[PDB]
Amino acid sequence: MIQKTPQIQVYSRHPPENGKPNILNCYVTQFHPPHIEIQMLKNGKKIPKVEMSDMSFSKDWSFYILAHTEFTPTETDTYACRVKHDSMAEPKTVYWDRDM
Amino acid sequence: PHSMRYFETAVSRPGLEEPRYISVGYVDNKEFVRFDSDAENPRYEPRAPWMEQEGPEYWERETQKAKGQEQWFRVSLRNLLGYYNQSAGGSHTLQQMSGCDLGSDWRLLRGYLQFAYEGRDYIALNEDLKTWTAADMAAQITRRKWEQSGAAEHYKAYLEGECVEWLHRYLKNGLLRTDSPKAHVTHHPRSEVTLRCWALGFYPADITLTWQGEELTQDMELVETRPAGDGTFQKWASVVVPLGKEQNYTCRVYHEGLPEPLTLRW
Amino acid sequence: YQLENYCGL
């Protein structure tokens, strides 16, 4: 009866440049209960070998996780983080905006 | 200025009468031990190089205590269930924060003990380490029992005794850290033009960006501080201004790793 | 060095 809705940021570790390898982070926070499903998408298609930090919660009790994967940003490739949580009636997909 | 903390979580499952107990330990907000009841042979594991010098007996003892606490969370989840008349077979979380803050002399500044249920404040030890604060009625029944039994004397002995001592061992086995925000403003034509002040690659995470030449109230656009994943953090703060009168506002960054606040723009 | 709880909730 008291869930908390995840909050998602998708952003590169290093400044984005087309053609140069980098790390793309999806950072999900502010959620409870701790169970969560997280997916990173390249052009809609699941990226395998995504690495994910272990269960942690912050000083306000809410949980968080950092997903991340290698990637080489291009003009046309879209990257996303789709997140399923019982707070939400259905998965939320957040698309990477390279200026944020 | 230092700290030790254990963060504990138990989570109840449908059917499986036993919850999942995870326990993480931090020194200076950095992970160094972790316990997860879902491992095949559950045990505390080092999370940082400097823990691997602690010998077999350390791990045995602390693992045994992890298991004790796990049992304690079992019982307390089970009871909470009755306190709040919650249905059987649901999913429920009990969490505890505990530990101590040391000043720059390695003396105790403050001891901490808090419990939350379903991610809500349940009960907490006041900074006096003698009395308690209860969030709702359930928790006051708790409070009442504990203050009748003097449990606070137990937790006070831990926070003033072993938490400080062992933190000292840990610090010795670890003498200061910080990285400063490399920063810059970006330009983004709204329909008018957005100015995003950027702060990158800093540690620790605490930071203040603001715009200005009077303190720029709001229409502030900011993101929660986020980890680059290399050990550093990022944050930006933007403001929408129309054209040409960029060169009238100011971005300033406040970070303890800076010789002085940065004053930025273009 | 972990805290060991006293009275349960």
CSV table of C-alpha atoms in Angstrom, one decimal:
chain,number,residue,atom,x,y,z
A,1,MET,CA,0.0,0.0,0.0
A,2,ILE,CA,3.0,2.3,0.3
A,3,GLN,CA,5.2,2.0,-2.7
A,4,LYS,CA,7.6,4.7,-4.0
A,5,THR,CA,8.1,5.5,-7.8
A,6,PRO,CA,11.6,4.9,-9.3
A,7,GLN,CA,13.5,7.8,-10.8
A,8,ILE,CA,15.7,7.3,-13.8
A,9,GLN,CA,18.6,9.1,-15.3
A,10,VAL,CA,20.4,7.9,-18.5
A,11,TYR,CA,23.8,9.6,-19.1
A,12,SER,CA,27.3,8.9,-20.3
A,13,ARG,CA,30.3,8.6,-17.8
A,14,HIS,CA,32.5,10.6,-20.1
A,15,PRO,CA,31.3,13.5,-22.3
A,16,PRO,CA,29.6,12.0,-25.4
A,17,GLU,CA,31.4,12.1,-28.8
A,18,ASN,CA,30.2,10.2,-31.8
A,19,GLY,CA,32.6,7.3,-32.5
A,20,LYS,CA,34.4,7.3,-29.2
A,21,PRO,CA,33.7,4.4,-26.6
A,22,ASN,CA,32.2,5.3,-23.3
A,23,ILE,CA,30.1,4.0,-20.5
A,24,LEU,CA,26.3,4.6,-20.5
A,25,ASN,CA,24.7,4.7,-17.0
A,26,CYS,CA,21.1,4.2,-16.1
A,27,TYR,CA,20.7,5.3,-12.5
A,28,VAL,CA,17.5,4.3,-10.8
A,29,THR,CA,16.7,5.8,-7.3
A,30,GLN,CA,14.0,6.7,-4.9
A,31,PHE,CA,12.2,3.4,-5.0
A,32,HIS,CA,10.5,1.0,-2.6
A,33,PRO,CA,10.0,-2.0,-2.2
A,34,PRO,CA,13.6,-3.0,-3.4
A,35,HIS,CA,12.5,-5.4,-6.1
A,36,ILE,CA,13.0,-4.0,-9.5
A,37,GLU,CA,13.7,-5.1,-13.1
A,38,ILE,CA,16.1,-3.1,-15.3
A,39,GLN,CA,17.0,-3.3,-18.9
A,40,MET,CA,19.2,-1.2,-21.2
A,41,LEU,CA,18.2,-1.0,-24.8
A,42,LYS,CA,20.2,-0.2,-28.0
A,43,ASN,CA,17.7,0.8,-30.6
A,44,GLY,CA,15.0,-1.0,-28.7
A,45,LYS,CA,17.0,-4.2,-28.4
A,46,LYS,CA,18.1,-5.5,-25.0
A,47,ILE,CA,21.8,-5.1,-24.3
A,48,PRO,CA,23.4,-8.2,-22.8
A,49,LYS,CA,26.2,-8.1,-20.3
A,50,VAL,CA,24.8,-5.1,-18.5
A,51,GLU,CA,26.5,-4.7,-15.1
A,52,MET,CA,24.5,-3.8,-12.0
A,53,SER,CA,25.5,-2.6,-8.5
A,54,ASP,CA,24.1,-4.6,-5.6
A,55,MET,CA,21.1,-3.7,-3.4
A,56,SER,CA,21.7,-0.4,-1.6
A,57,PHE,CA,19.4,2.1,0.1
A,58,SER,CA,19.9,5.7,1.0
A,59,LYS,CA,19.5,7.6,4.3
A,60,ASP,CA,15.8,8.3,3.5
A,61,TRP,CA,15.3,4.5,3.3
A,62,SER,CA,14.5,4.5,-0.5
A,63,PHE,CA,16.5,2.0,-2.6
A,64,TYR,CA,18.7,2.6,-5.6
A,65,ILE,CA,20.7,0.8,-8.2
A,66,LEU,CA,23.3,1.8,-10.9
A,67,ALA,CA,23.0,0.0,-14.2
A,68,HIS,CA,25.8,0.5,-16.8
A,69,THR,CA,27.2,-0.8,-20.1
A,70,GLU,CA,29.9,0.0,-22.5
A,71,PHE,CA,28.8,1.8,-25.6
A,72,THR,CA,30.0,3.9,-28.6
A,73,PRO,CA,27.5,6.7,-29.3
A,74,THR,CA,26.4,7.4,-32.9
A,75,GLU,CA,24.2,9.9,-34.7
A,76,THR,CA,21.4,7.5,-35.1
A,77,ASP,CA,21.6,4.8,-32.4
A,78,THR,CA,19.1,5.3,-29.6
A,79,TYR,CA,19.9,4.1,-26.1
A,80,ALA,CA,17.3,3.5,-23.3
A,81,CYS,CA,16.7,2.2,-19.8
A,82,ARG,CA,13.4,0.4,-19.3
A,83,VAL,CA,12.5,-0.1,-15.7
A,84,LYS,CA,9.7,-2.3,-14.2
A,85,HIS,CA,8.6,-1.7,-10.6
A,86,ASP,CA,5.4,-2.4,-8.7
A,87,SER,CA,5.0,1.3,-8.1
A,88,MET,CA,4.2,1.6,-11.8
A,89,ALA,CA,1.3,0.1,-13.8
A,90,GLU,CA,3.8,-0.7,-16.5
A,91,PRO,CA,7.5,-0.5,-17.5
A,92,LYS,CA,9.0,3.0,-17.9
A,93,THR,CA,11.4,3.6,-20.7
A,94,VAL,CA,13.8,6.5,-20.4
A,95,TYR,CA,15.7,7.5,-23.5
A,96,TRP,CA,19.2,8.9,-23.3
A,97,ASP,CA,19.5,12.6,-24.0
A,98,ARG,CA,23.2,13.4,-24.7
A,99,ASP,CA,22.8,17.0,-23.5
A,100,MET,CA,21.5,15.9,-20.0
B,1,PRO,CA,36.0,13.6,10.0
B,2,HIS,CA,34.9,9.9,9.7
B,3,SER,CA,32.0,7.4,10.0
B,4,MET,CA,31.0,3.8,10.2
B,5,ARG,CA,27.6,2.5,9.3
B,6,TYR,CA,25.7,-0.8,8.8
B,7,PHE,CA,22.7,-0.7,6.6
B,8,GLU,CA,20.4,-3.7,7.1
B,9,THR,CA,17.4,-5.0,5.2
B,10,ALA,CA,15.1,-8.0,5.6
B,11,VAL,CA,12.4,-8.7,3.0
B,12,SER,CA,9.5,-11.1,3.4
B,13,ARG,CA,8.5,-13.5,0.6
B,14,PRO,CA,5.2,-15.3,-0.3
B,15,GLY,CA,5.2,-19.0,0.8
B,16,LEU,CA,8.9,-18.9,1.8
B,17,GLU,CA,8.5,-18.4,5.5
B,18,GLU,CA,12.1,-17.1,5.6
B,19,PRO,CA,12.9,-13.5,4.5
B,20,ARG,CA,16.0,-12.3,2.6
B,21,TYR,CA,18.5,-10.6,4.9
B,22,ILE,CA,21.1,-8.3,3.3
B,23,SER,CA,23.6,-6.4,5.5
B,24,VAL,CA,26.1,-3.8,4.2
B,25,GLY,CA,28.9,-2.1,6.2
B,26,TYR,CA,30.4,1.2,5.2
B,27,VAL,CA,33.4,3.2,6.4
B,28,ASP,CA,33.3,6.8,5.3
B,29,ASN,CA,30.3,6.1,3.1
B,30,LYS,CA,32.3,3.4,1.3
B,31,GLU,CA,31.3,-0.3,1.2
B,32,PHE,CA,33.7,-2.8,2.9
B,33,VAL,CA,31.6,-5.8,4.0
B,34,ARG,CA,28.4,-7.3,2.7
B,35,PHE,CA,26.1,-10.2,3.7
B,36,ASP,CA,23.4,-11.7,1.6
B,37,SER,CA,21.3,-14.6,2.9
B,38,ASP,CA,20.6,-15.6,-0.7
B,39,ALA,CA,24.2,-16.7,-1.3
B,40,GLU,CA,24.6,-20.5,-1.2
B,41,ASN,CA,26.8,-20.4,1.8
B,42,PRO,CA,26.1,-17.0,3.3
B,43,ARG,CA,29.1,-15.2,4.7
B,44,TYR,CA,30.6,-11.7,5.1
B,45,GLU,CA,32.8,-10.7,2.3
B,46,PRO,CA,35.4,-8.0,2.0
B,47,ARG,CA,34.3,-5.2,-0.4
B,48,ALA,CA,37.6,-3.4,-0.5
B,49,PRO,CA,41.3,-4.4,-0.6
B,50,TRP,CA,42.1,-3.3,3.0
B,51,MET,CA,39.7,-5.7,4.5
B,52,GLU,CA,41.5,-8.7,3.2
B,53,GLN,CA,44.1,-8.5,6.0
B,54,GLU,CA,41.6,-9.2,8.7
B,55,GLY,CA,42.0,-12.9,9.4
B,56,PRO,CA,39.7,-16.0,9.4
B,57,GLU,CA,38.4,-15.4,13.0
B,58,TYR,CA,37.1,-11.9,12.0
B,59,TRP,CA,35.0,-13.4,9.2
B,60,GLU,CA,33.7,-16.3,11.3
B,61,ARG,CA,32.6,-14.0,14.2
B,62,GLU,CA,31.0,-11.3,12.0
B,63,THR,CA,29.2,-13.9,9.9
B,64,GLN,CA,27.8,-15.5,13.0
B,65,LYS,CA,26.5,-12.1,14.0
B,66,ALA,CA,25.0,-11.6,10.6
B,67,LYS,CA,23.1,-14.8,11.2
B,68,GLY,CA,22.0,-13.6,14.7
B,69,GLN,CA,20.7,-10.4,13.2
B,70,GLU,CA,18.9,-12.3,10.4
B,71,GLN,CA,17.0,-14.3,13.1
B,72,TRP,CA,16.2,-11.0,14.8
B,73,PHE,CA,14.7,-9.6,11.6
B,74,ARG,CA,12.7,-12.7,11.2
B,75,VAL,CA,11.1,-12.4,14.6
B,76,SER,CA,10.6,-8.6,14.2
B,77,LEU,CA,9.0,-8.9,10.7
B,78,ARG,CA,6.8,-11.6,12.1
B,79,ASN,CA,5.7,-9.4,15.0
B,80,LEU,CA,5.2,-6.3,12.9
B,81,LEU,CA,2.8,-8.3,10.8
B,82,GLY,CA,0.6,-8.6,13.9
B,83,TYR,CA,1.1,-5.1,15.1
B,84,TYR,CA,-0.3,-3.8,11.8
B,85,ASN,CA,-2.7,-6.8,11.1
B,86,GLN,CA,-1.0,-7.4,7.7
B,87,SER,CA,-2.2,-10.4,5.6
B,88,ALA,CA,-0.1,-13.5,5.4
B,89,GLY,CA,1.9,-14.1,2.2
B,90,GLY,CA,2.6,-10.5,1.3
B,91,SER,CA,5.9,-8.8,0.8
B,92,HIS,CA,7.2,-6.5,3.6
B,93,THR,CA,10.5,-4.8,4.3
B,94,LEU,CA,12.2,-4.1,7.7
B,95,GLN,CA,15.3,-1.9,7.6
B,96,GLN,CA,17.9,-0.6,10.1
B,97,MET,CA,20.6,2.1,10.0
B,98,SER,CA,23.2,2.1,12.6
B,99,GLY,CA,26.7,3.4,13.4
B,100,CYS,CA,28.7,6.3,14.5
B,101,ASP,CA,30.3,9.6,13.4
B,102,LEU,CA,33.7,10.7,14.6
B,103,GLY,CA,35.1,14.2,14.7
B,104,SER,CA,38.6,15.1,13.3
B,105,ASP,CA,40.0,14.2,16.7
B,106,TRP,CA,38.9,10.6,16.5
B,107,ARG,CA,36.3,11.2,19.2
B,108,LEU,CA,32.6,10.3,18.9
B,109,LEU,CA,30.5,13.1,17.5
B,110,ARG,CA,27.2,11.2,17.2
B,111,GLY,CA,25.8,7.7,17.4
B,112,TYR,CA,22.9,6.5,15.2
B,113,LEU,CA,20.2,3.8,15.4
B,114,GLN,CA,17.1,3.9,13.2
B,115,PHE,CA,14.4,1.3,12.2
B,116,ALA,CA,12.0,1.7,9.4
B,117,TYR,CA,9.2,-0.5,8.2
B,118,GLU,CA,7.8,-0.7,4.7
B,119,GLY,CA,10.3,2.1,4.0
B,120,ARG,CA,8.7,4.3,6.7
B,121,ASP,CA,10.3,5.6,9.9
B,122,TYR,CA,9.3,3.3,12.7
B,123,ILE,CA,11.6,4.1,15.7
B,124,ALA,CA,14.9,5.8,16.4
B,125,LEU,CA,17.3,6.5,19.1
B,126,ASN,CA,17.7,10.2,20.0
B,127,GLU,CA,21.2,11.8,19.8
B,128,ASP,CA,21.2,11.6,23.6
B,129,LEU,CA,21.5,7.8,23.2
B,130,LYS,CA,19.1,7.6,26.1
B,131,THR,CA,15.7,8.1,24.7
B,132,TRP,CA,13.5,7.2,21.7
B,133,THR,CA,11.3,8.7,19.1
B,134,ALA,CA,8.3,6.6,17.7
B,135,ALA,CA,6.6,7.4,14.5
B,136,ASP,CA,3.2,5.8,15.0
B,137,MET,CA,1.3,3.9,17.7
B,138,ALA,CA,2.9,0.6,16.9
B,139,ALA,CA,6.3,2.1,17.4
B,140,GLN,CA,5.2,3.6,20.6
B,141,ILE,CA,4.4,0.2,22.0
B,142,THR,CA,7.9,-0.7,20.9
B,143,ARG,CA,9.3,2.5,22.5
B,144,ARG,CA,7.5,1.8,25.7
B,145,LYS,CA,8.8,-1.8,26.0
B,146,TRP,CA,12.4,-0.8,25.2
B,147,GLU,CA,12.5,2.2,27.6
B,148,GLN,CA,11.1,-0.2,30.3
B,149,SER,CA,13.9,-2.7,29.5
B,150,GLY,CA,16.7,-0.2,29.1
B,151,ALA,CA,17.8,-1.3,25.6
B,152,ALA,CA,19.2,2.2,25.1
B,153,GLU,CA,22.0,1.3,27.5
B,154,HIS,CA,23.0,-1.5,25.2
B,155,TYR,CA,23.0,0.5,22.0
B,156,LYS,CA,24.8,3.4,23.8
B,157,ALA,CA,27.5,1.0,25.0
B,158,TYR,CA,27.9,-0.1,21.4
B,159,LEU,CA,28.0,3.4,19.8
B,160,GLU,CA,30.4,4.7,22.5
B,161,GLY,CA,32.4,1.6,22.8
B,162,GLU,CA,33.0,-1.0,20.0
B,163,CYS,CA,31.8,1.2,17.1
B,164,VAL,CA,34.4,3.8,17.8
B,165,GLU,CA,37.2,1.3,18.6
B,166,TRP,CA,36.6,-0.9,15.6
B,167,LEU,CA,36.2,2.2,13.3
B,168,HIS,CA,39.7,3.2,14.6
B,169,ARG,CA,41.1,-0.2,13.6
B,170,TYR,CA,39.5,0.2,10.2
B,171,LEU,CA,40.8,3.7,9.6
B,172,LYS,CA,44.3,2.6,10.6
B,173,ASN,CA,44.0,-0.3,8.1
B,174,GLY,CA,42.9,2.2,5.4
B,175,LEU,CA,44.6,10.2,5.2
B,176,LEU,CA,42.2,12.1,3.1
B,177,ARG,CA,40.2,11.9,-0.2
B,178,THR,CA,38.3,14.6,-2.3
B,179,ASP,CA,38.1,15.4,-6.0
B,180,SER,CA,37.0,18.8,-7.2
B,181,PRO,CA,34.2,19.6,-9.8
B,182,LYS,CA,35.6,20.3,-13.2
B,183,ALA,CA,32.8,22.6,-14.4
B,184,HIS,CA,31.3,24.4,-17.5
B,185,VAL,CA,28.1,26.1,-18.9
B,186,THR,CA,26.4,24.9,-22.1
B,187,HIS,CA,24.1,26.8,-24.4
B,188,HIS,CA,20.7,25.4,-25.7
B,189,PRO,CA,18.2,27.4,-27.8
B,190,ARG,CA,14.8,26.9,-26.2
B,191,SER,CA,12.4,28.8,-28.6
B,192,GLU,CA,14.9,31.8,-25.9
B,193,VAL,CA,17.9,29.8,-24.7
B,194,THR,CA,18.7,27.4,-21.9
B,195,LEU,CA,22.0,27.6,-19.9
B,196,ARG,CA,23.1,24.4,-18.2
B,197,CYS,CA,25.8,24.6,-15.6
B,198,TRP,CA,27.8,21.4,-15.4
B,199,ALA,CA,29.8,19.9,-12.6
B,200,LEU,CA,31.7,16.7,-13.3
B,201,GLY,CA,34.1,14.3,-11.7
B,202,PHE,CA,33.8,15.3,-8.1
B,203,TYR,CA,34.0,13.4,-4.8
B,204,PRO,CA,32.3,13.3,-2.4
B,205,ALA,CA,28.9,13.7,-3.7
B,206,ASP,CA,27.8,16.7,-1.7
B,207,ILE,CA,27.8,19.9,-3.9
B,208,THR,CA,25.8,23.1,-4.5
B,209,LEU,CA,25.3,24.7,-7.8
B,210,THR,CA,23.3,28.0,-8.1
B,211,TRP,CA,22.6,30.8,-10.7
B,212,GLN,CA,22.6,34.5,-10.1
B,213,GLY,CA,23.4,39.5,-9.7
B,214,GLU,CA,20.9,38.3,-7.2
B,215,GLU,CA,20.5,34.7,-5.9
B,216,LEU,CA,18.3,33.0,-8.6
B,217,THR,CA,15.2,31.8,-6.8
B,218,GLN,CA,13.7,29.3,-9.2
B,219,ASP,CA,12.9,28.1,-12.6
B,220,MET,CA,16.0,26.4,-11.5
B,221,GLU,CA,16.5,23.2,-13.5
B,222,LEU,CA,18.5,20.6,-11.6
B,223,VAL,CA,19.1,16.8,-11.5
B,224,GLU,CA,19.8,14.7,-8.4
B,225,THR,CA,23.5,14.1,-8.0
B,226,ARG,CA,24.6,11.1,-9.9
B,227,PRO,CA,27.6,8.8,-10.0
B,228,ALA,CA,29.8,8.6,-13.1
B,229,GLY,CA,30.5,5.1,-12.0
B,230,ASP,CA,34.3,5.6,-11.8
B,231,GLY,CA,34.1,6.8,-8.2
B,232,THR,CA,33.2,10.4,-9.1
B,233,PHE,CA,29.8,12.2,-9.4
B,234,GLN,CA,28.0,14.6,-11.7
B,235,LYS,CA,25.3,17.2,-11.4
B,236,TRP,CA,24.0,20.1,-13.5
B,237,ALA,CA,21.7,23.1,-12.9
B,238,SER,CA,20.1,25.0,-15.7
B,239,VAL,CA,18.2,28.2,-16.2
B,240,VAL,CA,16.2,29.4,-19.3
B,241,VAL,CA,17.1,32.9,-20.3
B,242,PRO,CA,16.3,34.7,-23.6
B,243,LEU,CA,18.9,35.6,-26.2
B,244,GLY,CA,21.8,37.9,-25.9
B,245,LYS,CA,21.4,38.6,-22.1
B,246,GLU,CA,23.3,35.4,-21.4
B,247,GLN,CA,26.3,37.2,-19.8
B,248,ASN,CA,23.9,38.5,-17.0
B,249,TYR,CA,23.4,35.5,-14.7
B,250,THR,CA,26.1,33.5,-12.8
B,251,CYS,CA,26.7,29.9,-12.1
B,252,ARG,CA,28.6,29.2,-8.9
B,253,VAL,CA,29.7,25.8,-7.6
B,254,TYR,CA,30.3,25.0,-3.9
B,255,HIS,CA,32.4,21.9,-3.2
B,256,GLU,CA,34.6,21.1,-0.2
B,257,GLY,CA,37.3,19.9,-2.7
B,258,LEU,CA,37.6,23.3,-4.2
B,259,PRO,CA,40.3,25.8,-3.0
B,260,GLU,CA,37.3,28.3,-3.5
B,261,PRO,CA,33.8,28.3,-5.0
B,262,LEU,CA,34.0,28.4,-8.8
B,263,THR,CA,32.4,31.3,-10.6
B,264,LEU,CA,31.4,30.2,-14.1
B,265,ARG,CA,29.9,31.2,-17.3
B,266,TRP,CA,30.0,32.3,-20.9
C,1,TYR,CA,32.1,-4.7,13.6
C,2,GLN,CA,28.3,-5.2,13.5
C,3,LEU,CA,25.8,-4.1,16.2
C,4,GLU,CA,23.9,-7.0,17.8
C,5,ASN,CA,20.3,-6.1,18.6
C,6,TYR,CA,18.6,-6.4,21.9
C,7,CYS,CA,14.8,-6.5,22.2
C,8,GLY,CA,13.0,-7.2,18.9
C,9,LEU,CA,10.5,-4.6,17.6
